[PDB]
């Protein structure tokens, strides 16, 4: 689906916009980096919108640890 899924409004403060986006992380070129939040049935969020530093994002991508976005991170599991 190449871009479908990338241009969503991932959270109430989402800054990623198909009409304004530019690369931020060293791994980005033409699309925003994203990470899967395991809360409930799960959902995708833009890593930048979560204020995730690059190394944190990369480490998460290189492991099996589940990630929980800022909106759901405090919810009793």
């Amino acid at each position: 689906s190449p871009e479908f899924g990338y241009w969503i409004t991932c959270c109430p403060t989402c800054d990623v916009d198909i009409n304004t986006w530019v690369p931020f992380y060293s791994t980005e070129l033409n699309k925003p980096a994203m990470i899967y939040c395991s809360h409930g049935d799960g959902h995708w969020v833009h890593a930048q919108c979560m204020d995730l530093e690059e190394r944190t994002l990369i480490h998460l991508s290189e492991g099996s640890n589940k990630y929980y976005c800022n909106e759901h991170v405090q919810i009793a599991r």
């Binding site: 990338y6 992380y25 060293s26 791994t27 980005e28 070129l29 699309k31 925003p32 980096a33 994203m34 990470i35 899967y36 395991s38 995708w44 890593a47 994002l57 990369i58 998460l60 991508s61 492991g63 099996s64 640890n65 589940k66 990630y67």
Partner: peptide
């Protein structure tokens, strides 16, 4: 965690 656009270039 599953991610997108995190592969080194």
């Amino acid at each position: 965690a599953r991610t997108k656009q995190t592969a080194r270039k």
